A and B are shown apart, each in its own frame.
Chain A
């Protein structure tokens, strides 16, 4: 679970 597209 990442905090947005910018990973």
Chain B
């Protein structure tokens, strides 16, 4: 019945900066078993299974780089990352194994990088889909930063607000960027009543919205 508490819940730093995060246990994790505190640190990159980083409060697991350093004793513990890399994008959990097991609720690590304008791409519906009666128009917005972005769909100049499904990638561990998908889905019937289709992106990197269009005929 031991609880684990992590803070901060979230964290952001630029590549190269140092970061520190804290984990506290409701009771002592130390023992008669040598100096040992039974506390571990785990890393989870988006889509991936967890990875053990540190055990015994301070000891590096094999194949974990030295820029990861865990510390603390009793009921107070710390993970420090010196020289944060884009690839350290992850959630970090702390875990007690002094009695049974209990995980922390995690500290999410976000990376801060330079600003980056999106590659915007527009894709009309496919022949296959149209044949079966749907009309999905997809707009990709790729490799931008910061994550704050807004999309507007225009059919023949009029903004359209339903049938729109958006999805954001987790932050990219190679270049620290984000990407986004937007799909506007209509009936084929509704799609064949108009010509010009436009996706408009509003981002910090341009004062003027980034536009891509196509014409159903042309």
User: Which residue numbers of A lie inside 8 Å of B, CB to CB?
Assistant: 3-7
Contact = CB atoms under 8 A, between A and B. Distances in A.
A2 B215 CA distance: 69
Nearest to A4: B99
B31 interface: yes
Interface of B: 29, 31, 33, 36, 38, 97-101
Chain B binding surface SS class: loop
Contacts, number: 21
Nearest to B37: A5
A5 B36 contact: yes
Contacts of B99: 3-4, 6
A-B interface, 6 closest residue pairs, ranked by CB to CB distance from nearest = A5-B38, A6-B98, A4-B99, A6-B31, A4-B97, A4-B98
Contacts of B29: 6
Nearest to B101: A4
